[PDB]
Design a protein around this motif. Structure first.
Motif, mmCIF file in Angstrom:
data_model
loop_
_atom_site.group_PDB
_atom_site.id
_atom_site.type_symbol
_atom_site.label_atom_id
_atom_site.label_comp_id
_atom_site.label_asym_id
_atom_site.label_seq_id
_atom_site.Cartn_x
_atom_site.Cartn_y
_atom_site.Cartn_z
ATOM 1 N N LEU A 2 42.550 44.943 50.482
ATOM 2 C CA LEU A 2 41.248 45.728 50.710
ATOM 3 C C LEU A 2 41.590 46.136 52.245
ATOM 4 O O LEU A 2 41.395 47.180 52.796
ATOM 5 N N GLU A 3 41.656 45.125 53.128
ATOM 6 C CA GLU A 3 41.742 45.291 54.562
ATOM 7 C C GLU A 3 42.996 46.494 54.924
ATOM 8 O O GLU A 3 42.741 47.338 55.509
ATOM 9 N N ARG A 4 44.261 46.254 54.195
ATOM 10 C CA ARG A 4 45.110 47.318 54.301
ATOM 11 C C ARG A 4 44.981 48.595 54.061
ATOM 12 O O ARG A 4 45.177 49.431 54.665
ATOM 13 N N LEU A 5 44.207 48.611 52.903
ATOM 14 C CA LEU A 5 43.937 50.082 52.295
ATOM 15 C C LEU A 5 42.861 50.892 53.145
ATOM 16 O O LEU A 5 43.168 51.917 53.322
ATOM 17 N N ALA B 31 39.195 57.066 46.823
ATOM 18 C CA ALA B 31 37.688 57.277 46.210
ATOM 19 C C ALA B 31 37.882 56.976 44.469
ATOM 20 O O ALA B 31 37.116 56.532 44.069
ATOM 21 N N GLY B 32 39.102 57.106 44.105
ATOM 22 C CA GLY B 32 39.295 56.812 42.713
ATOM 23 C C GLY B 32 39.730 55.522 42.520
ATOM 24 O O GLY B 32 39.880 54.999 41.397
ATOM 25 N N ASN B 33 39.540 54.442 43.510
ATOM 26 C CA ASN B 33 39.734 52.983 43.093
ATOM 27 C C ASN B 33 38.275 52.509 42.366
ATOM 28 O O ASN B 33 38.285 51.338 42.445
ATOM 29 N N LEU B 34 37.381 53.237 42.214
ATOM 30 C CA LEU B 34 36.155 52.660 41.357
ATOM 31 C C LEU B 34 36.340 52.807 39.995
ATOM 32 O O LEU B 34 37.453 53.005 39.453
ATOM 33 N N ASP B 35 35.560 52.148 39.184
ATOM 34 C CA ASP B 35 35.582 52.002 37.902
ATOM 35 C C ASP B 35 36.704 51.038 37.229
ATOM 36 O O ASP B 35 37.023 50.062 38.186
ATOM 37 N N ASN B 36 37.564 51.283 36.578
ATOM 38 C CA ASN B 36 38.863 50.435 36.082
ATOM 39 C C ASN B 36 39.947 50.812 36.666
ATOM 40 O O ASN B 36 41.112 50.845 36.144
ATOM 41 N N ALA B 37 40.049 51.558 37.893
ATOM 42 C CA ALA B 37 41.233 51.984 38.700
ATOM 43 C C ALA B 37 41.281 51.138 39.931
ATOM 44 O O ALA B 37 40.393 50.960 40.613
ATOM 45 N N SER B 38 42.470 50.474 40.158
ATOM 46 C CA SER B 38 42.916 50.086 41.476
ATOM 47 C C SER B 38 41.904 48.977 42.181
ATOM 48 O O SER B 38 41.726 47.890 41.370
ATOM 49 N N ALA B 39 41.242 49.196 43.332
ATOM 50 C CA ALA B 39 40.675 48.150 43.880
ATOM 51 C C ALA B 39 39.403 47.780 43.145
ATOM 52 O O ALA B 39 39.321 46.434 42.827
ATOM 53 N N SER B 40 38.592 48.399 42.462
ATOM 54 C CA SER B 40 37.371 48.084 41.864
ATOM 55 C C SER B 40 37.962 47.609 40.446
ATOM 56 O O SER B 40 37.511 46.494 40.018
ATOM 57 N N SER B 41 38.986 47.762 39.905
ATOM 58 C CA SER B 41 39.792 47.244 38.831
ATOM 59 C C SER B 41 40.198 45.879 39.239
ATOM 60 O O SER B 41 40.134 44.933 38.441
ATOM 61 N N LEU B 42 40.744 45.765 40.454
ATOM 62 C CA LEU B 42 40.891 44.140 40.805
ATOM 63 C C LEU B 42 39.649 43.702 41.059
ATOM 64 O O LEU B 42 39.723 42.497 40.506
ATOM 65 N N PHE B 43 38.704 44.154 41.492
ATOM 66 C CA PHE B 43 37.303 43.426 41.698
ATOM 67 C C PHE B 43 36.800 43.322 40.303
ATOM 68 O O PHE B 43 36.214 42.380 39.830
ATOM 69 N N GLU B 44 36.938 44.339 39.279
ATOM 70 C CA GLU B 44 36.608 44.056 37.731
ATOM 71 C C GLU B 44 37.556 42.866 37.228
ATOM 72 O O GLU B 44 37.072 42.096 36.690
ATOM 73 N N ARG B 45 38.670 42.761 37.647
ATOM 74 C CA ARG B 45 39.697 41.685 37.300
ATOM 75 C C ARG B 45 39.060 40.700 38.183
ATOM 76 O O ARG B 45 38.976 39.184 37.355
#
Lengths: 147, 92, 43, 49, 43
Positions: A2-5, B31-45
């Protein structure tokens, strides 16, 4: 991660911030050119004002003839200025909205990390809390008391 | 000459929008990191992992049952009423 | 340029006409309701 | 200060910008109340733990 | 020169027309209100 991104975004956001001003610089540069074209047009108008004087309208007609050449430049250029105004306004709104979104996303980033540690924080004590009954420490105590 | 400068005049303006999509896309992809993709997917994980661990304690440490919910509340009524009954009568 | 802007319209759907009426319709009361108190606070 | 002197036109515009901040105030304010439960419950866990 | 001045207009946004009317409109009462007392202090 997260910090890196978010680090690249800071570089990205300044890229929005840096070159966006160039859009305005080009825009207002045309505005000055319009004034210069209008200024010379005013000079022709000023010269035209001195042409009709003394009752010789022939020169005035010719003087305005050259002006129309600059008026077309003024008209064509002036239209571009109004058209380009919408682009600069809308793009700025994008940045203002986008900036508000990034900080909010960053604002919730640490808050999510607040709960991320919680389970790791909570699980590390729960695993020890499982030492009761017939498991681990109390099992040893159950073993001991049987002993 | 008037045409060349105008063509050159619009050259940089076109470059103003050329960077825009590259500028705009680089933030949209993040901005596509929301929902079930990337960062929020990790947060969802993660939150699922957050919810996965909390289930573990509910097994080794069973949560209160509705039976104790009524007892704790029902006993609380007398726990407060009984105490205030003496207090309200101690110095009535 | 038009290819990329379509990408955001997918991950970030644009406002629908339903919200266009709501935002405008709610704005009418949003301004009217506020000025109703302001115009009556010190009428 | 806009409604004063009998010019309500400026006051209407002034409140228009406010609603932009009110939405921020409303949205942000809702988060504060929601986050209050998390901080309270977690503290109870620590006190009990 | 015009490139740099645009930079400050971003980090330091220029006054908006809304404040132009406010500063001028408030100035009218700012001067009128002050002279109202001064013209009445020793009328």
């Amino acid at each position: 991660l997260l910090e890196r991104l978010l680090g690249e975004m800071e570089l990205e956001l300044i890229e929005l911030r840096r070159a966006l001003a160039q859009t305005i610089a080009t825009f207002k540069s045309t505005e000055r050119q319009r004034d210069a074209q209008q200024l010379i047009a005013q000079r022709w108008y000023e010269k035209a004002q001195a042409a009709l004087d003394r009752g010789n309208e022939q020169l005035a007609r010719e003087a305005l003839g050259q002006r129309q050449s600059y008026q077309s430049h003024t008209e064509a250029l002036g239209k571009s200025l109004g058209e380009q105004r919408a682009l600069v306004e809308q793009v700025r709104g994008q940045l203002q909205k986008l900036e508000r979104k990034y900080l909010e996303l960053k604002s919730q980033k640490n808050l999510y990390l607040a709960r991320l540690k919680s389970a790791i924080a909570a699980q590390k004590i729960e695993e020890i809390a499982g030492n009761l009954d017939n498991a681990s420490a109390s099992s040893l105590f159950e073993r001991i008391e049987t002993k | 000459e008037r045409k060349y400068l105008e063509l050159k005049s619009q050259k940089n303006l076109y470059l103003a929008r050329l960077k825009s999509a590259i500028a705009a896309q680089k933030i949209e992809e993040i901005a596509g990191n929301l929902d079930n993709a990337s960062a929020s997917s990790l947060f969802e994980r993660i939150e699922t992992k957050i919810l996965e661990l909390e289930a573990e304690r509910e097994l080794l440490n069973p949560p209160p049952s509705p039976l104790d919910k009524k007892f704790e509340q029902w006993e609380e009524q007398q726990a407060v009423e009984a105490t205030l009954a003496a207090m309200k009568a101690r110095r009535s």
